[PDB]
Amino acid sequence: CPRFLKVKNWETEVVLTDTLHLKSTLETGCTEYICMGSIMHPPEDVATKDQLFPLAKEFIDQYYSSIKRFGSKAHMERLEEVNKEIDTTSTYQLKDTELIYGAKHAWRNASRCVGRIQWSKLQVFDARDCTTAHGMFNYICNHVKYATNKGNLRSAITIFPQRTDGKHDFRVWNSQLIRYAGYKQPDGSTLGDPANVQFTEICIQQGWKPPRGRFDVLPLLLQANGNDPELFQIPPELVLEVPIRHPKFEWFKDLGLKWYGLPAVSNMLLEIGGLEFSACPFSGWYMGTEIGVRDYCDNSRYNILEEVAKKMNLDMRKTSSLWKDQALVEINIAVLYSFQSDKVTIVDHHSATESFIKHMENEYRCRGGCPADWVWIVPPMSGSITPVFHQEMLNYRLTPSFEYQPDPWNTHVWK
Amino acid sequence: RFLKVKNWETEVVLTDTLHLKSTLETGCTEYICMGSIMHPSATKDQLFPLAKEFIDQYYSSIKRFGSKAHMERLEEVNKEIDTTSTYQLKDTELIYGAKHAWRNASRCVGRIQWSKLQVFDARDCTTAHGMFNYICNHVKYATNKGNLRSAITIFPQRTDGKHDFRVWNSQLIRYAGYKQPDGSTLGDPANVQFTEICIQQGWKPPRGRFDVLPLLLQANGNDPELFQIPPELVLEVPIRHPKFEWFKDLGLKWYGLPAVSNMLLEIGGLEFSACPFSGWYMGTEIGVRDYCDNSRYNILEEVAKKMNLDMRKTSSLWKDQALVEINIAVLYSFQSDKVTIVDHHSATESFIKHMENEYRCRGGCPADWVWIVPPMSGSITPVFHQEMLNYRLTPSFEYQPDPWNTHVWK
Ligand code: HEM
Ligand code: HEM
Ligand SMILES: Cc1cc(N)nc(CCc2cc(F)cc(C#CCN(C)C)c2)c1
Ligand SMILES: Cc1cc(N)nc(CCc2cc(F)cc(C#CCN(C)C)c2)c1
Ligand SMILES: C[C@H](O)[C@H](O)[C@H]1CNc2nc(N)[nH]c(=O)c2N1
Ligand SMILES: C[C@H](O)[C@H](O)[C@H]1CNc2nc(N)[nH]c(=O)c2N1
Ligand SMILES: [Zn+2]
């Protein structure tokens, strides 16, 4: 691999030089012959002693380099203490400092995240002392209340105990901490969020009494130490919601739409120094298009374009009237207006992509690069009028990292 | 191995076997993906295997692989590479190769049309005047009084690199751009440099906002020469809006013929450095990129003014509102003037149908998601949710250096 790679911005002519890609670890999925850049996802199997030694050393070296203590006595002593741990116990425990550093860098390294200008302002909650699902519930409730902060949202992550043999995993079965239920009807229609029908049916099987509405917050389904998961209802006062109204169309409120304020991903795996944190829910704040374009206007989601177009009285007979595009904008205007009126942190796609360009440029200057997944970074509407559209990006995998993992109902051995 | 692609909206999975036939590089490695890089970075010995592969797939496509005609052509080509260091394609091979370079263009959402391509053989051309004549016939044929027809005109192949045929215009029809004294730019700012080369070569600019640039044509490595396309051959559409009567007052127009003339067509190891090809527009190419890119006509401000939109904060989405209206006007204008155009909903629809066709009859379809997804309203078009595999099949269209950086003037 060459030592310098150049990326160009085609709107501004700015050229940046990437050297950080020389630290890339795992595979992208691509080869010299095929690019998998648009592929979304390109047991008791755990790291062995021989696999763990170099992964820990690499991480510890990186941590001590970051604190300007590389080669120091504390660096060599930490390396020796970790090596002894992996020898006698075939794993090791991170220090609180290293845990915080690793989590912030997994975010910093997350190539699909447009919000990384905030990466160093992450509140890390250490929940490695948790033993039961009730305790996981307590930790998640605290996370939610802290991150929500009455609408002045703060980014946060709660980290449950790492994987040991793979048969004792901590898992949040929810894909996100706050989601709305989906219900398949006998006639084939769906009520609520069609994306969540499978998980909703799991919750119902596990004992959840479904209120069968359009916006029913799903219960938490929480697995501690490999045991069967347990259901808990998030106290509704901790779930901040925003009714969606429009600054011009008085009728928009009559659509009865709302959404929750806190985007909190809970199905990903956090890898730090070869250790695997299978339950690491993290939350930030929404970019408006995640709600106004994807949640509301995906055909397989709430799919409200038709109804909004009708109330806008648009010609829905020709696609070339762009009635869909026209209604999409008004929906996203309403979502941003509703969050701002209620003083709930949200960012529009223009501000967020401009901030990301400034972040990426800083990372190139200070760090030697910034891995970025153009397919995910560019917003799902108005792409070319945002600056990221015109920005060439390089995508590669740095560790610490957030990774996908199998859905736990596909792997869990029921007690 | 066999590679699978899923559509996340329909859950349709397709199976790709065609990728096993690629050989050119994508630009990526197992450790770095360059999928958003626009431009990632022959003797008798290099040439025959490339010729062999192309002839092999041609005779396979007409179902006479290993036939006597196939064997004789392989022999005829070898004897020709021996004695001339190159070879000439048969007419049937030229047409098949041009259609398949289009079929293989991973960045083109229009490929459902690939087999309906009119191929104009211009390999007997020797002068820039001859090139001008051929390009005029192309434009008239492809324009067809608004009922646009896909076409390509193929000039002589590269011989030594010193006698290249080149269309210096990046596209056959474009508007000039002029650097003003007061700093800003009149016309199309992407073309300021090319416009200045035309002026420097003697072109008398009208210094309007929509001045069709002259053709600048290079034959056989000679200095390029200027030619004015006769105006009755250049079809244009004044842009108006179905509801905003003030929209025509903006004074906007565009040309109907999109015609790429700066690319290189590779067929069986031969290089055609001048191969202008044309189709018809997708409306977003004009309404989003040409008019609303900050480095182009940059009219969002003005349109948002006349729409009276609140422009004091981005979260009003004033830019997004103005953008949709501009693209309504463009589609409405071309449709009213019966000039062929396709909106991004219909175009991406067709491309999904195309992909399914290609996976079934051919085992795959190389596609570049970064270029295929339209520059506006991405996720409400079906390609957004379609996984695509990108890989390089030959015959192909390739980028090449700009002629003004390589040409030694005479
Ligand atoms: C603080 C404000 C934040 C904003 C505005 C933001 C924005 C976004 C957006 C718009 C996406 C695309 C999501 C989608 O389309 O489903 C995304 C993805 C992602 N973000 Fe951020 N994010 C924020 C905070 C965070 C934090 C705190 C973390 C981790 C500690 C994080 C890690 C990620 C990851 C790993 C992805 C990829 C998700 C996936 O592959 O499904 N983000 N972000
Ligand atoms: C018939 C209607 C056609 C439509 C609607 C169409 C649509 C498009 C669009 C929207 C692009 C993106 C252009 C850009 O953003 O600059 C594109 C690219 C491309 N098209 Fe098609 N196209 C058509 C015909 C053709 C034909 C006839 C050929 C060749 C014979 C062709 C070959 C290509 C190539 C090579 C590219 C990539 C250009 C580049 O990399 O800059 N297309 N097409
Ligand atoms: C930390 C963070 C910030 C932000 N601003 N956004 C996200 C993603 C939030 C989210 C919410 C949700 F309800 C569903 C999904 C998803 C998904 C998977 N997708 C392929 C359908 C993601 C995370
Ligand atoms: C065959 C065809 C059909 C179509 N529908 N469209 C095209 C592209 C047309 C075009 C016109 C133009 F005037 C400029 C460009 C460009 C460019 C380079 N870009 C990276 C800035 C492309 C080609
Ligand atoms: C097939 C394609 O990769 C898929 O639709 C991706 C496209 N880009 C995306 N970008 C973001 N931010 N979120 C997504 O869910 C997707 N989906
Ligand atoms: C950096 C990025 O590759 C570049 O802006 C691309 C993105 N996608 C595109 N897609 C099309 N059709 N045309 C373009 O010019 C571009 N530009
Ligand atoms: Zn790639």
Locate all alpha helices (DSSP H) within A125-283, ordered by sequence: 133-148, 197-205
Is residue B156 located within the same domain as residue B274? yes
In a domain, A395, yes or no: no
- Over its C-alpha atoms, chain B yields an Rg (Å, rounded) of 23
Q: How many domains does chain B have?
A: 3
- Ligand 2: which residue has its CA nearest to atom 18? B108
- Letter for the amino acid at A378? V
Contact B31 A37 (CB under 8 A): no
- Token code pair at residue B280: 């018809």
- How far is CA A318 from each of CA A64, A381, B335, B345, rounded to the nearest angstrom? 62, 20, 12, 10
Within-domain flag for A71: yes
Nearest to A383 among B319, B376, B391 (CB): B376
Residues 123-152 of B with CB under 8 A from A: none
Does residue B304 lie within any of the structural domains? yes
Q: What is the position in ligand 2's atom list of the atom closest to the CA of B117? A: 27
Does residue B154 sit in the same domain as residue B28? Answer: yes
CB B54 within 8 A of CB B394: yes
Tell me, yes or no, whether B341 and B241 share the same domain: yes
What is the domain-level CATH number for residue B324? 3.90.1230.10
Q: Are A159 and A49 members of one domain?
A: yes
How were these coordinates obtained?
X-ray
Final residue belonging to a domain, choices A308, A336, A351? A351
Q: Is B355 on the interface with A (CB under 8 A)?
A: no
- CB within 8 Å: B25 and A32: yes
CB contact under 8 A, A288 and B335: no
**Residue B350 is inside which H or E element, if any?**
helix B344-362
| H or E element that contains B255 | strand B253-255
Q: Which of A30, A340, A384 sits opposite B315 (nearest CB)?
A: A340
Residue span of the structural domain in which B204 resides: 124-149+164-235+399-403
- With beta carbons under 8 A apart, name residues in chain A contacting B293: 11, 384
- Per the annotation, does B384 bind a ligand? yes
* B259: nearest Cα among B391, B407, B123, B136: B136
Q: Is residue B253 one of the residues assigned to a domain? A: yes
For B61, phi and psi rounded to 5 degrees?
Answer: -75, -30
On whether any CB of chain A is under 8 Å from the CB of B27, the answer is yes
How large is the C-alpha radius of gyration of chain A?
Answer: 23
Size of interface A-B (CB pairs under 8 A): 205
Residue found under tokens 């659509």 = A255
- Catalytic residue numbers of B, as ranges: 108, 111, 280, 285
Please give the Cα distance from A379 to A348 (Å, whole number). 10
Say if B410 falls within a structural domain.
no
Tell me: do B145 and B88 sit in the same domain.
no
Looking up residue A91, the CATH number of its domain turns out to be 3.90.340.10
Residue B380 domain-assigned?
Answer: no
CA nearest to A283, candidates A238, A252, A328, A233: A238
**Residue B170's domain is classified under what CATH number?**
3.90.440.10
Q: B394 at the A interface (CB within 8 A)?
A: no
Quote the CA–CA distance of A139 and B133 in Å, as a whole number.
77
B45 and B155 in a single domain? The answer is: yes
Q: Which residues of B touch A24 (CB under 8 A)?
A: 31-32
Shared-domain flag, residues B116 and B30: yes
| Distance from chain centroid for Cα B27 | 20
Closest CA to B237 of B165, B156, B140, B336: B336
Please state, in angstroms and rounded to a whole number, the distance separating the CA atoms of residues A379 and A375.
9
Which residue, among B97, B104, B275, has the nearest Cα to B88 in the 3D structure? B97
Interchain proximity A34–B384, CB inside 8 Å: no
- Give the span between the Cα atoms of B146 and B195, in whole angstroms: 27
* Ligand 1 mean position, distance from CA A114 (Å): 7
Q: Are residues A246 and A236 in the same domain?
A: no
Tell me, yes or no, whether A391 lies in a domain: no
Residues of B in contact with A40 (CB under 8 A): 6, 8, 387
Chain A nearest C-alpha distance from B289 (Å): 7
For residue A188, count CB atoms less than 10 angstroms from its CB and return exposed for 0-12, middle for 13-18, buried for 19 or more: exposed
Q: Determine how β-strand A220-223 pairs with β-strand A230-232.
A: antiparallel
Work out the minimum CA distance from B125 to partner chain A, whole angstroms. Answer: 36
- The answer to whether B236 and B254 have CB atoms below 8 angstroms apart is yes
Nearest CA in chain B to A347: B315
313-342 in chain A: CB under 8 A from chain B: 319-322, 324-326, 328-329, 332-333, 336-337, 340
For A115-274, strand residue ranges (E) read: 123-126, 156-159, 171-172, 182-184, 190-192, 220-223, 230-232, 241-243, 258-260, 264-265, 269-272
Residue B14 CA, ligand 2 centroid: distance in Å: 24
Q: Resolution in A for the shown PDB structure?
A: 1.9
Non-local (6+) Cβ contacts of B31 within 8 A are: A1, A21, A24, A27, A28, A396, A397
CA nearest A160: which of A223, A101, A70, A205? A223
Residue A379 touches partner B, C-beta closer than 8 Å? yes
Q: A231: exposed, middle or buried (C-beta count within 10 Å: 0-12, 13-18, 19+)? A: middle
Pairing of strands A182-184, A190-192: antiparallel
Which tokens is B313 given? Answer: 């904060």
Question: Do the chains contact at B369 and A293, CB–CB below 8 Å?
Answer: no
Nearest Cα residue to atom 15 of ligand 5:
A376
CA of B109 from ligand 1 middle (Å) equals: 30
Q: Strand, coil or helix: what is A261? A: coil
Ligand 4 closest atom vs CA B278: 1
Q: DSSP letter for A176, please.
A: B
Phi, psi for residue B13 in degrees, rounded to 5: -105, 135
Ligand 6 geometric centre to CA of B397 (Å): 17
Q: Looking at the structure, tell me whether residues A29 and A73 fall in a common domain.
A: yes
Question: At residue A11, what is the residue type?
Answer: E
Q: Quote the minimal CA–CA distance from B322 to chain A in Å.
A: 10
- Residue A316 and residue A213 share a domain: no
Question: How close, in Å, is residue A344 to chain B by CA atoms?
Answer: 14
Does B112 reside within a domain?
yes
Residues of A in Cβ contact (< 8 Å) with B6: 40
Verify that A37 and A160 share a domain, yes or no.
yes
Q: How far apart are CA B27 and CA A32, in angstroms?
A: 6
Residue with tokens 């205007």: A333
Same domain, yes or no, for A147 and A252? Answer: no
| Burial class for A68, CB neighbours closer than 10 Å (0-12, 13-18, 19+) | exposed
Chain B residues with CB under 8 Å of A324 CB are: 345, 377, 380
Measured CA distances, A277 to A87, A144, A405 (Å): 21, 19, 11
Work out the number of other CB atoms within 10 angstroms of the CB of residue A210: 16
